[PDB]
């Protein structure tokens, strides 16, 4: 099973994730101070999430195989069109085992982004996304609002909402407060981060392990098992 990550650039040789992430050719980001454009800052978000999924010391699915697509710039900003072209890149790679697609990003409700996610889900892809960090109804954001995507809100150790988006479009809540993971500040550095991106990466790791054990596990079965174990 492979976990595809659509996010910022990654520090692929950070010791926590070295060997896990196959950086793909894909890059589609909007235009980019010098400090904020250094690699250690550009790579921060995606490197932390690749660690949450696959990291040796702190991964949920330690040793998981990942593939990365760059859809967010050094400031963590992307476009719906770049994200769409990234999702098409994944579909083309699939047409040429089970696949998990992790989308730790959000914009406003988008008909086309939801439609693209729906087409991948209809083809058997398991998509996992962040509910959003706006203390608002996740139905107003995308891909969070897509019913075919597993939308993940963030809770703490006491199951309290971290703030996290909520509502009928959130399928489950997962750990998203002070999550220790790989820091791109240095090759062995770690940092704690909070957010629905971290919660979604946790669920992607659980899904990857469930699909590895039961390759014939469908999205409908998997979804209910993930919701229950939350």
């Amino acid at each position: 099973v492979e976990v595809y990550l659509l996010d910022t650039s990654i520090q692929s040789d950070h010791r926590e994730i070295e060997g896990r992430v196959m950086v793909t050719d894909f890059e589609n980001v909007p235009e980019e101070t010098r400090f904020h454009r250094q690699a250690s800052k550009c790579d921060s978000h995606g490197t932390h999430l690749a660690g949450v999924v696959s990291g040796r010391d702190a991964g949920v699915a330690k040793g998981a195989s990942m593939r990365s697509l760059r859809v967010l710039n050094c400031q963590g900003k992307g476009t719906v069109s770049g994200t769409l072209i990234g999702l098409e890149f994944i579909r083309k790679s699939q047409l040429v085992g089970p696949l998990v697609v992790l989308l730790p990003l959000a914009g406003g409700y988008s008909r086309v982004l939801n439609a693209a996610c729906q087409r991948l889900a209809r083809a058997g892809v398991v998509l996992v996304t962040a509910a959003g960090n706006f203390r608002d109804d996740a139905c107003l954001y995308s891909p969070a609002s897509a019913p075919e995507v597993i939308t993940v809100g963030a809770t703490n150790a006491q199951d309290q909402p971290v703030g996290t988006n909520f509502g009928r479009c959130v399928d489950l809540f997962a750990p998203g407060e002070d999550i220790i993971g790989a820091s791109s500040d240095c090759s062995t550095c770690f940092v704690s981060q909070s957010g629905t991106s971290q919660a979604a990466a946790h669920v992607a790791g659980i899904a990857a392990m469930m699909l590895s054990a039961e390759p014939e596990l469908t999205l409908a079965e998997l979804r209910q098992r993930l919701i229950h174990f939350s």
């Binding site: 992307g78 719906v80 072209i85 990003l105 988008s110 107003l140 957010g195």
Partner: protein
């Protein structure tokens, strides 16, 4: 019958770039012909357009950089299902 869509969060809108989504089962050759018709009609009206990407495999359609003044014209192209103005997404 085609509809226009844009981000409800005004600060995240990116006017000037649009995803033109064609009806299901529209072939790649028809997506290319529809993009060519849009460019020709926009040129006849005195507007520059640029096709940035042609979609095929997941959804049929294309990404176009053009003035929003051309939206009424583009919505009338017969294979169009809907048109969406680009918008920003962010790391969570």
């Amino acid at each position: 019958t085609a509809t226009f869509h844009r981000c409800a969060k005004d600060p995240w809108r990116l006017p000037g770039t649009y995803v033109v989504v064609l009806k299901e089962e529209t072939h790649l050759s028809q997506s290319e012909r529809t993009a060519r018709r849009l460019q020709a009609q926009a040129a006849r009206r005195g507007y520059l357009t640029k096709i940035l990407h042609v979609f095929h495999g997941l959804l049929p359609g294309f990404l176009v950089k053009m003035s929003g003044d051309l939206l009424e014209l583009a919505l009338k192209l017969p294979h169009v299902d809907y048109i969406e103005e680009d918008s920003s997404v962010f790391a969570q």
